[PDB]
Design a protein around this ligand. Structure first.
Ligand SMILES: [Cl-]
Lengths: 97, 97
């Protein structure tokens, strides 16, 4: 299978510190799932309420098994309370180096 | 500031995706010769032919800006403008695992 990259754009409606806490707990959850490779949370420079998360998984099935975990639900609910999300699943076509 | 910057550029490709990808490879190689270039990833949305995201990391904003100001960037920018629409943002990494 090929690696998949999940890209999630967040518009944060409450306090960014609270969002980062909730996000940190979400990321720790995913980080102990089989097939998790890496993640980066990015904050937009000219804004205070704009974030993008990039998460890499070994394959599509590992990503969906993680998302299907009942243990994700509290994290999904908390994130939904604090933010509007637009997400997509991608594959990498070029990487340099 | 002196913070590492991550440039996120979302593209809708209206010409041939193969031509878009080829132009991008040459664009990335140009950037790879620029001081302060860290890494480049071109992502394609799964089961869309026409939706891409470039993630480009630079040691700081000034190194990025200077790269975009080089005369050598112009042919690449010109080719991308012929083939795609795009929306960009500049970000700083907040969390990583
Ligand atoms: Cl990442």
């Amino acid at each position: 299978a090929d690696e998949v990259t999940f890209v999630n754009r967040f518009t944060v409606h409450g306090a960014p510190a609270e969002f980062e806490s909730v996000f940190a707990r979400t990321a720790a959850f995913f980080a102990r799932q089989p097939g998790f490779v890496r993640h980066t949370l990015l904050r937009e420079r000219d804004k205070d309420n704009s974030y993008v998360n990039i998460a890499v998984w070994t394959d599509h099935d590992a990503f969906r098994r993680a998302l299907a975990q009942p243990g994700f639900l509290p994290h999904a609910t908390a994130l939904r309370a604090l933010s509007t999300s637009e997400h997509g699943l991608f594959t990498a076509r070029q990487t340099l180096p």
